[PDB]
Design an enzyme around this catalytic site. Structure first.
Site, mmCIF file in Angstrom:
data_model
loop_
_atom_site.group_PDB
_atom_site.id
_atom_site.type_symbol
_atom_site.label_atom_id
_atom_site.label_comp_id
_atom_site.label_asym_id
_atom_site.label_seq_id
_atom_site.Cartn_x
_atom_site.Cartn_y
_atom_site.Cartn_z
ATOM 1 N N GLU A 35 2.846 -17.837 7.361
ATOM 2 C CA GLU A 35 1.884 -16.748 7.417
ATOM 3 C C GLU A 35 2.566 -15.388 7.229
ATOM 4 O OE1 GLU A 35 -1.328 -16.605 7.357
ATOM 5 O OE2 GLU A 35 -2.021 -18.609 7.897
ATOM 6 N N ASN A 46 -7.277 -8.415 2.275
ATOM 7 C CA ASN A 46 -8.099 -9.473 1.702
ATOM 8 C C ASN A 46 -9.154 -8.855 0.798
ATOM 9 O OD1 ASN A 46 -7.739 -10.739 4.909
ATOM 10 N ND2 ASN A 46 -6.940 -11.840 3.130
ATOM 11 N N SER A 50 -11.045 -6.665 4.747
ATOM 12 C CA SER A 50 -10.350 -6.820 6.021
ATOM 13 C C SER A 50 -8.850 -6.999 5.780
ATOM 14 C CB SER A 50 -10.913 -7.996 6.811
ATOM 15 O OG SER A 50 -10.657 -9.217 6.146
ATOM 16 N N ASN A 59 -6.815 -11.685 11.580
ATOM 17 C CA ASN A 59 -7.785 -10.930 10.791
ATOM 18 C C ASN A 59 -8.594 -9.844 11.521
ATOM 19 O OD1 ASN A 59 -10.786 -10.948 9.405
ATOM 20 N ND2 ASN A 59 -9.145 -11.016 7.892
#
Length: 129
Positions: A35, A46, A50, A59
């Site tokens: 990640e 994204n 977000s 997130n």
């Protein structure tokens, strides 16, 4: 701060992640690796506007407030910047809430695609836990 594999394992263990909701330590270390590459300062934007923050790429649409994601919920009750800290406490506490949500660790795309069903025990090999 960029963590070492074993250093992160120990930190997560101390914070209660080993076997939390049935997920062994290896799963959490694997998720962090893919990640954020063990970097607490990682952020990624994204397509929906977000942003993902920190070691576990949490997130902003649902978990933290960054002041620029309209209509988002701040379920972990913290500013997203708190998740970029060298102290992983905030990320860990919020991660615990996410994994208990119902979908388990599937909430983390990298975990689902790159850790799930693999020999996750390899991520903690050689570490003094």
């Amino acid at each position: 701060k960029v963590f070492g594999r074993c250093e992160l394992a120990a930190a997560m263990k101390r914070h209660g992640l080993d076997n939390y909701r049935g997920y062994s330590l290896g799963n959490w270390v694997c998720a962090a690796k893919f990640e954020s590459n063990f970097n607490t300062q990682a952020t990624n934007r994204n397509t929906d506007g977000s942003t993902d923050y920190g070691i576990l790429q949490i997130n902003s649409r649902w978990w933290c407030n960054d002041g620029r994601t309209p209509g988002s919920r701040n379920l972990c009750n913290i500013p997203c910047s708190a998740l970029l800290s060298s102290d992983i406490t905030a990320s860990v506490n919020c991660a615990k809430k996410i994994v208990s949500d119902g979908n388990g660790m599937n909430a983390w795309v990298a975990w689902r695609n790159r850790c799930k069903g693999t020999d996750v025990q390899a991520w903690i090999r050689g570490c003094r836990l």
